[PDB]
Each structure stands twice: as structure tokens, then as C-alpha cells.
Design an enzyme around this catalytic site. Structure first.
Site: not given
Ligand SMILES: [Ca+2]
Ligand SMILES: [Ca+2]
Ligand SMILES: [Ca+2]
Ligand SMILES: [Ca+2]
Lengths: 824, 145, 78
Positions: A152-153, A157, A199, A202-203, A458, A460
Site C-alpha cells: 500500500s502506498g 491506484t 500497512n 491494505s487490500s 504480495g 511477506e
């Protein structure tokens, strides 16, 4: 190399410059440049060859003489400092998030600039990935999928908006699909996104945005496919994490009328929220807008959660504004909130041992309010829900023998599982509904092909890893086989288009790792299903079983054999290490069996399906017509574990990917503070490893990882050649230079547009040009006749070409001026 | 079908069509080379013969397609008449010889930068008998090599 | 023949059909292409195929270059 500088580990930059002053069994000793003395050790496979010029950058990382993780990091770093956020590695794109609006690159004049122009003829850009997928879609009549990675970030998007806006402006009649997805995003983020440890926003699902095209390759509509929603988050979370955003947004922003209807409170009052973080996201201003009767004890003590953009009160209003702008009315908004509320209360229902009447269990007295609210909100009867949560139903037979039905009391733990099993089915079906309602904004009856952007959580690993990390890392191991397969196929096709030779490429395949997990009957997943069948299911038995069925497996090792010291006291039956593409990950097998069950027994399944509330029936009214298709077949699929359910859904994801040409974007996040011009080396390096970029740089060393076009080798070395050779065009310059020097044929290959090299031979080439000016000068003198002959035939065969095309124009126009058999 | 050694020579001549070095051409590029060597096709005739070999449909020719784009059912004498017609594009004033001035003009027209001294150097290597001019007999021995 | 002046009594390219307009059908019948010779010119616009040469594609060329059969005169063909 031999005295020349190198790259070596550094805690905050990833790599630092140094020299190898000593050598050792498994370690070099490096003396820094900057410290000029503070010497440290470093594993040999952790230091790399560095480029000569530390001030050069390149648009494709294959132009570099050595192509490894360390030189890549330094190349994108220099480019980041010039605002050039995009950089290729072959056809792969690398997009470091600038955190500011870069002028002119997203203009209308720039979109036209990339239309048609192939990958490599223009500068690195997301527009060029977009256009390669379109060009391959229409020519090969093949659906495409751009797979993008990044936490995320990272700018996923922004990247996806750039794709959609490029493809509609270039190949679409009007078409405002990019603007309806963004206006509909806050809605998906509520039911789909959640706070993890690393995060805040987070999706937790694989989103596959896709633009659909008719037979003539023109945008007709859009579609948003969804895969692998994390079910486990629904019922329980760790500290420092949270459930899905919808729960907290609703507990902060709802009016006091709504709060009484649904009987909401502060999240510390709900089982499904209170084991994890109970604080809202809020700044000084929004904390004032939330009533005190919503704030948890821990939100009062520790204060608010901070984020530059997340705010639970502000996001409830932004979600409400979303519902309006899509089409949802006031009736269907309270509907979604009634089912979310019904899930929260369900969790508060508890149980206690019976009086040994086939000693089942019974509802507690304190949990009577739980049952009363949960039932009104889910449209269930109070008594029927009390019976189904504490008793199963079974046949007296299994085979074709006749058998009446009976009632089997469940145990306490069995009733907990049922309660949670109903909670995860209900939320899931509610999530499938939200997503379907987004799709009804831009529908389409029929379509031929599609171009889809895909992002999923992803790879981790944390200090302590469990079944949740196992599944994500399993999903990514299969996605890295796909990645690695498609880059290998892209490379083998590039060496044939260029005409290099048979030249085979070495390839460590990761199928033995995927087999460790998902093989039938002997993989970890089916060994975990096997434990669910023993009379005393233990997590220790499961773990010992794993080690025995894979004795000397390359990818499986015992916890004690970890390079870290935090896993030094884990017993052999208390864990196992998997050697994933990105790294070793010590899993702890505690609770693995519990996390592998979310089965909902049919009696309770049939209760929610036939709810009095029309909306909740409609969540399974796809399931009224689709059970009508299965039902018997659907009851057989309720016997599957969360492990094998994960595999099956993941295999549908991969089959969709398999039937499509794949491009890849690697969205990087430069720092945690969301600020521009701050390249955190170590954080970007860690991203390159887990995104599977480093794994791909290993693959390409097997082939020809270094290549420079003729115009590139002309700009580099013309200054060392004589004035006669410098006048030549880049292709003849290189042809003369390659023949003069007389290079080995297996190491260097003169291709169609570019010169290709084996590992560390561009460097060897470069030293021939600089180490001996008298030798090189003599070799160019020796080829002067061949060059005069080469330049003769170039212009002679070009003049014969024009005459042969003159003969083609007449020959063709002789049959098209002898077509007169028709006219008259 | 052509020889392997005949394919190599057309491959280097294909680089004069494909100046930028992307391995591909259009009618804007292959048209400008035709016009530079005495020919004058219109923006229309070349569209039809592109459309034979181009299987993908887009407007771009790679090298193996360029080979079958100029290949045709050829008469026995046609091959030799083309080699002679090539010599005559080099020999403007037309007396069976190619001078330094005449070779320099074709070079510059195809996009080859070189001094006057470099031009004389070429003429000299091709020039077997030693009269400082390239007759047809010698033009073909260079072509074949 | 006898059938050629009797068939003529009741009563070849179009570009080169000006220069002419008995002695006219003399050199018209003398320089007539064979059957097998015209079967070579059928494989002209054959990109690949297998005896055929498309339907819609074999038309763009007949209206764009050479002695161009009209777009209206084409509709009265296919
Ligand atoms: Ca070109
Ligand atoms: Ca083509
Ligand atoms: Ca002359
Ligand atoms: Ca001579």
C-alpha cells in the site's frame, strides 16, 4: 573482478560501495569508501560487481554490464533523483511512486506520443505497457493481463488510472470507466480493505480490474473480478491489526438513530473486533465529530490511530456519498449495515457445557441479548438459530442404505466453529454483492477480449508466521512460477527473433516447492486435511508428518536449521521452514488445524438461505438458482478445508492468467512517510526481493542478460575509433568492431538490432576497448579492406533492392491491369 | 529461394531502409529510399505489396517479410537485367564507368557521410586494371565478393 | 471464320481500348492470353490461401490502383 569496487550490504541503503580487502570460507571482508576503515564481514553471495560510472543511468537495466539486485537498485536510484520514475528490465516496468504531480508525462500530447510506438523506441512509461497489451490483443486476438505488484502506498491506484485513461483516450469512444471505478473505490475499500501490522490501508483480496473490448477492438464495458478474500480476518485479528474497515467506519460515523436500531457500541464490546486494535483513525478535528459513547477504553487511553488519509468518520461519509453516486438507495444502504451488524452480534453469542445428555452445549444467559439482536438483523427466528448453533443433523446411513435423520448435539468448540462459520459465509456473500453492484455501473451484454490490471497481496514474512502467511506465500509462489515462466518465454522468443542460435538457458524451476505444498496426498495441504480425520487431531502430529513424507527435500527443513537465532528453540514438531523464491520463512505450526476449518453444517446453512429478510435471501439467491444447479454438489463442496478451498480458488486465478498474454509492472514504494525525493534503499531492496524481481534477475543470467543496441555501442565507443569509422552508421560501426576484435562466438552474439552478451562479457568487451589502445588500433587497420567491401555491397544491394521493388510494383500491377476479364 | 550468402547482403542493404535501427519500416521510409535512387512510386502502389507479406496487419515489415515482398516469378534473363540496371543508377552520364564523383553522389543520396578522400579509397579497391574508374565487370566482382 | 462475321452481324483491356476506337478485332483476337496464363494472374493477390484469394480483401486493390474498377461497379460483381 580484481581490485575494482563492489556493492555490499548496508542496513539503510541496501548496498554501499567498498573493496574486498580479505577473503574467507563463506565471507568477504569489505572496507567502505566513506568510512575509509570501519571494516565489516559480509556473505559472498551478498556482494556484487558494480558499474564503472556511478553517475550513469539507463532506460533498460540490460544495458548495464552486470545485472544484479545491487546495480538495479543504484540505477533506479539515480533515475529517481532526476524524476524518471519508470525503468525497464526487458519488458518489465518499474514504477517508483514520486509522491507529486510530475509535469508533462501524463499529458494528452504524451498519450499520442506512445500510440503505436513499440516498447523500447520510447522512454520507459506505463503508457508503453498499456499500448503493448493493446497491440498484442488485437494482433494475436488474445486477452491480456498486466500484473502489478507493490504494498500500500506504492502507486498501484495511480498506475491503474493511467492505464485505463490511456486505453480509452486512444482506443475508446468517449468512455469514462476510469472515473466510475474511482468513485466506486471507497465502497470496495470498506468491505475489502483492513489494517495490517505493516500497512494501515491494505487490500485483502485479489482485485482484477478489466476493460472489455468487442470484435473490432473498442471499449464496450468494464468488469471487476475478485479472488481470495481473507476470511480469517472476519472473526479474529492479532493486536496491531483490525477487521475490515466497514465495521469501524460504521461504529464512528453512524447517526444515533442508526446506532439504536442495530444496537451498535464501541468495538471493545464485540468479539469479532476486540481481540485486535479497537482505536479509530482520526486527526484532531475528526476525533471531535465522534461521540464519546463510541470510543473504546483503549482509544481513550492511547489516543487515535494516525494516517495521512484514512479516517473512519470521514470515510463513512465518503462511503455514503459513494453509494449515492453509483446508484444505491437509502433502503439498500441500511440493508448492508443490517448484515454487518448481524455479524457483529453473532460473535458475542457464547456457549457452556450441558448435563451429559450426549453432552452437547447450551447458550449462556448473558448471551441472550446477542441472540435477540443477531436474529432480528439476519431475519432468523430466535429459537431456530439457538438449535442450529448447538445441534447438527445427520443421516443414520452414508451408502445407498435407507436412513432417517437424527439430531446430534455439538460440543462447545464445535458450536464456536459453527458460529464463526456462519459469520464468514455471510460477510463473504455480502462482499460478493458489493462488488457485483459496482459492476452494474458499467455493464455489457457480450465481449471478445479484455485487458486487466491485477493486484494481490504480495509475499511477506514476520518474526512469527502462521497459517495466514502460509497461504499468502503459497499464492505468491504460484504467481512467481507464472512470472518466471512468462519472462523465460519472452526471452527465448527474443533470441529467435534476433537470430542468435540454439543457445539453451539454465533455469532453476520452483515447481518442487509448489509440490511441497499442493501435491495431492503428500503435500502439506493434504497432510493437514489428513490430521482432521484422526481421533485426536494434533498440530504436532501434522508437523511430524510433514517432515517424514519429505525426508531430504530441498525446500523443507526443520526450524532448528534457521540462520536466525529467534527460531533456535522451536522443536522439530513445532514448525517447518519453507525455501520460497524470495527467502526462507520459518513457520510455526501451532493452531494450523484450527485455521484449516471453516465448514458450515447444512442445517445452519439452510437457515440463513431461507431468511425472512428478502435482501439476505438475495445474498444467497444467486445460491437459490446455483444450489439448484449444485445443492447436492454444493453440499459435497462444504466438506473442503480452507487450505483446499484456497488452492482451488487460486487455481481459477491462474487459469485466467494462463489464457492471457502477461505484462508486468513493479510498483515500488520509496519510503514509509509518503514524502517526495526520499529513496530509502533498504526498503526498496526488500521490495525488489518479495516482488520476485531478484528471482527474475537470476533467471536472465542463464541466458543473455546484457544487451546494447548498435546506436548505444556507437555512442560509447566511437571516440576510441578512427575518424573514418566514426562516420559510419551505428550498424556498420558495430559490424566492423565485432569482426576486428575477433571475439569468441559462444560468449558474444551479433543479433538483429542489438549485440548480446553472456554474464560479465560486456565488461570483458569494455576492457578490450580501454586496456590496450595500440592493439585495438592495429586490429582496425587489419579489417580496412573488409570494411571498404562491406560499404560497397551495402549501397550496391540497396540499389538492386529499389529496382526489385520497381519490378514488384509492375509485376503486381500487371495482374491488376489484366483483371479486365470482368469489366466488359 | 535465395542463397544464405544472398540473404546476408540484402540484410545490410535493409539497414539503409531502416535508419533508426528498430528492425522495421513503413511507406514513409522505404518510399524515401526509392525516390533517392531515380525511382518515383506514388503513395498508393506500395500499399498493395506491403499487404501481401504483412500477415499481422498493422503496416510494419520485418526482414524475412521484406525478402518475400520483392521475390517474384522471375524470367531467366530478368536476374541479369536487374544487376545491369543497378550499375546504370550509379552511372548517371552513362559511359560504362563509375567515377569518384558518381559514387559520391549515390552515397550521399542514401545517407552515408564521408570525406572526398574516403570516396576515392573505395573506387581504388574495386578498380582492378588501374584506370581510376569502375567498369561493369568490376562492379559485379565486388557485389559477389 | 463464318461464325465470327455472323456473330459480329447481330452485334481485352479498357485502358488500351481507346487506340482502336473488322480490322479492330484482328489484333484483339491475335494477342489473347491463354487459360493457364490467366491462372497465374489469379495467384497474384494470393497472400497465402489454398487456391482461394479472399472475398472482401480482393477489392481494395481493384479500386485503389491500376485501371480502377469503380466502387459502384464493384457492388455489381460480388
Ligand atoms: Ca525503422
Ligand atoms: Ca508485421
Ligand atoms: Ca561514368
Ligand atoms: Ca577500372
Amino acid at each position: 573482478e580484481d581490485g575494482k569496487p563492489v556493492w555490499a550490504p548496508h542496513p539503510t541503503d541496501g548496498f554501499q560501495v567498498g573493496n574486498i580487502v580479505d577473503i574467507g570460507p563463506d565471507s568477504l571482508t569489505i572496507e567502505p569508501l566513506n568510512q575509509k576503515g570501519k571494516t565489516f564481514l559480509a556473505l559472498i553471495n551478498q556482494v556484487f560487481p558494480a558499474e564503472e560510472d556511478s553517475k550513469k543511468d539507463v532506460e533498460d537495466n540490460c544495458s548495464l554490464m552486470y545485472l544484479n539486485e545491487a546495480t538495479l537498485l543504484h540505477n533506479i536510484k539515480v533515475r529517481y533523483s532526476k524524476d524518471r520514475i519508470y525503468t525497464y528490465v526487458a519488458n518489465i516496468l518499474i514504477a517508483v511512486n514520486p509522491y507529486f504531480d510530475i509535469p508533462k508525462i501524463y499529458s494528452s500530447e504524451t498519450i499520442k506520443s506512445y500510440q503505436g510506438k513499440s516498447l523500447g523506441t520510447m522512454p520507459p512509461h506505463v503508457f508503453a505497457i498499456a499500448d503493448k497489451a493493446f497491440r498484442d490483443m488485437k494482433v494475436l486476438k488474445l486477452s491480456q493481463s498486466i500484473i502489478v505488484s507493490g504494498e500500500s502506498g506504492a502507486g498501484k491506484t495511480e498506475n491503474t488510472k493511467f492505464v485505463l485513461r490511456y486505453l480509452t483516450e486512444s482506443y475508446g469512444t468517449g468512455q469514462d470507466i476510469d472515473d466510475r471505478i474511482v468513485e466506486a473505490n471507497p465502497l470496495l475499500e470498506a468491505f475489502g480493505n483492513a489494517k495490517t501490522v505493516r500497512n494501515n490501508n491494505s487490500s485483502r483480496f485479489g482485485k482484477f480490474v478489466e476493460i472489455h473490448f468487442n470484435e473490432k477492438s473498442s471499449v464496450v464495458g468494464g468488469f471487476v473480478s475478485h479472488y481470495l478474500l481473507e476470511k480469517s480476518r472476519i472473526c479474529v485479528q492479532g493486536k496491531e491489526e483490525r477487521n475490515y474497515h466497514i465495521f469501524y467506519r460504521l461504529c464512528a460515523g453512524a447517526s444515533e438513530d442508526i446506532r439504536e436500531r442495530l444496537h451498535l457500541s464501541s468495538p471493545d464490546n464485540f468479539r469479532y473486533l476486540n481481540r485486535g486494535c479497537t482505536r479509530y483513525f482520526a486527526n484532531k478535528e475528526t476525533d471531535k465529530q465522534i461521540l464519546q459513547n463510541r470510543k473504546s477504553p483503549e482509544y481513550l487511553k492511547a489516543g487515535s490511530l494516525k494516517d495521512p488519509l484514512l479516517d473512519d468518520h470521514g470515510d463513512f461519509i465518503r462511503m455514503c456519498t459513494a453509494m449515492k453516486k453509483i446508484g444505491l438507495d437509502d433502503e439498500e444502504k441500511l440493508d448492508l449495515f443490517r448484515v454487518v451488524a448481524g455479524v457483529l452480534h453473532l460473535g458475542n453469542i457464547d456457549f457452556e457445557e450441558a448435563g451429559s445428555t450426549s453432552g452437547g452445549c447450551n447458550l449462556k444467559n448473558k448471551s441472550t441479548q446477542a441472540l435477540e439482536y443477531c436474529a432480528e438483523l439476519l431475519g432468523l427466528d430466535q429459537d431456530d438459530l439457538r438449535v442450529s448453533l448447538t445441534t447438527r443433523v445427520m443421516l443414520t446411513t452414508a451408502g445407498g442404505a435407507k436412513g432417517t435423520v437424527i439430531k446430534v448435539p455439538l460440543k462447545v468448540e464445535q458450536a464456536n466453529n459453527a458460529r464463526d462459520a456462519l459469520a464468514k459465509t455471510v460477510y463473504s456473500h455480502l462482499f460478493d454483492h458489493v462488488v457485483n453492484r459496482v459492476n452494474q455501473c458499467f455493464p455489457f451484454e457480450t465481449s471478445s477480449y479484455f485487458i486487466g490490471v491485477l493486484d494481490i497481496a504480495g509475499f511477506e514474512y514476520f518474526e512469527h508466521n502462521s497459517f495466514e502467511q502460509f497461504c499468502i506465500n503459497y499464492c505468491n509462489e504460484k504467481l512467481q512460477q507464472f512470472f518466471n515462466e512468462r519472462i523465460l518465454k519472452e526471452e527465448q522468443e527474443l533470441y529467435q527473433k534476433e537470430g542468435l542460435g540454439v543457445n539453451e538457458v539454465h533455469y532453476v524451476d520452483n515447481q518442487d516447492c509448489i509440490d511441497l505444498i499442493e501435491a495431492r496426498l503428500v503435500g502439506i495441504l493434504d497432510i493437514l486435511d489428513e490430521e482432521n480425520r484422526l481421533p485426536q487431531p494434533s498440530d504436532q502430529h501434522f508437523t511430524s508428518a510433514v517432515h517424514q513424507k519429505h525426508k531430504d527435500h530441498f525446500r523443507l527443513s526443520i526450524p532448528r536449521k534457521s540462520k536466525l537465532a529467534i527460531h533456535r528453540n522451536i522443536r522439530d514438531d513445532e514448525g517447518f521452514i519453507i525455501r520460497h523464491f524470495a527467502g526462507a520463512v520459518c513457520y510455526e505450526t501451532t493452531q494450523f488445524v484450527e485455521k484449516n476449518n471453516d465448514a458450515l453444517h447444512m442445517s445452519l446453512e439452510s437457515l440463513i438461505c431461507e431468511s425472512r429478510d428478502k435482501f439476505i435471501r438475495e445474498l444467497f439467491e444467486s445460491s437459490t438458482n446455483n444450489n439448484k444447479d449444485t445443492k447436492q454438489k454444493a453440499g459435497k463442496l462444504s466438506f473442503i478445508s480452507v487450505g483446499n478451498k484456497f488452492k482451488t480458488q487460486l487455481n481459477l486465478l491462474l487459469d485466467k492468467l494462463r489464457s492471457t498474454g502477461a505484462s508486468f509492472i513493479r510498483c515500488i514504494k520509496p519510503n514509509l512517510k509518503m514524502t517526495s525525493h526520499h529513496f530509502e534503499g533498504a526498503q526498496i531492496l526488500s521490495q525488489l526481493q518479495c516482488s520476485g524481481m531478484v528471482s527474475v534477475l537470476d533467471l536472465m543470467q542463464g541466458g543473455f542478460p546484457s544487451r546494447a543496441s548498435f546506436h548505444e555501442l556507437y555512442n560509447m565507443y566511437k571516440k576510441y575509433m578512427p575518424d573514418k569509422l566514426a562516420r559510419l552508421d551505428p550498424r556498420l560501426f558495430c559490424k566492423a568492431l565485432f569482426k576486428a576484435l575477433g571475439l569468441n562466438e559462444i560468449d558474444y552474439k551479433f543479433g538483429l538490432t542489438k549485440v548480446f552478451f553472456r554474464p560479465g562479457k560486456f565488461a570483458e568487451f569494455d576492457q578490450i576497448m580501454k586496456s590496450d589502445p595500440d592493439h585495438l588500433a592495429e586490429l582496425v587497420k587489419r579489417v580496412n579492406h573488409w570494411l571498404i567491401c562491406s560499404r560497397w555491397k551495402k549501397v550496391q544491394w540497396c540499389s538492386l533492392s529499389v529496382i526489385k521493388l520497381k519490378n514488384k510494383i509492375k509485376y503486381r500491377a500487371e495482374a491488376c491491369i489484366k483483371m479486365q476479364k470482368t469489366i466488359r | 529461394q535465395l542463397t544464405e550468402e544472398q540473404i546476408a547482403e540484402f540484410k545490410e542493404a535493409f539497414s539503409l531502409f531502416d535508419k533508426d535501427g528498430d528492425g522495421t519500416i513503413t511507406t514513409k521510409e522505404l518510399g524515401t529510399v526509392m525516390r533517392s535512387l531515380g525511382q518515383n512510386p506514388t503513395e498508393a502502389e506500395l500499399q498493395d505489396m506491403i499487404n501481401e507479406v504483412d500477415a499481422d496487419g498493422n503496416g510494419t515489415i520485418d526482414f524475412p517479410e521484406f525478402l518475400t515482398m520483392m521475390a517474384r516469378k522471375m524470367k531467366d534473363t530478368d536476374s541479369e537485367e536487374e544487376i545491369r540496371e543497378a550499375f546504370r543508377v550509379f552511372d548517371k552520364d552513362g559511359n560504362g564507368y563509375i567515377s569518384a564523383a558518381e559514387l559520391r553522389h549515390v552515397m550521399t543520396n542514401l545517407g552515408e557521410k564521408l570525406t572526398d578522400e574516403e570516396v576515392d579509397e573505395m573506387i581504388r579497391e574495386a578498380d582492378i586494371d588501374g584506370d581510376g574508374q569502375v567498369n561493369y565487370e568490376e562492379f559485379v566482382q565486388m557485389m559477389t565478393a
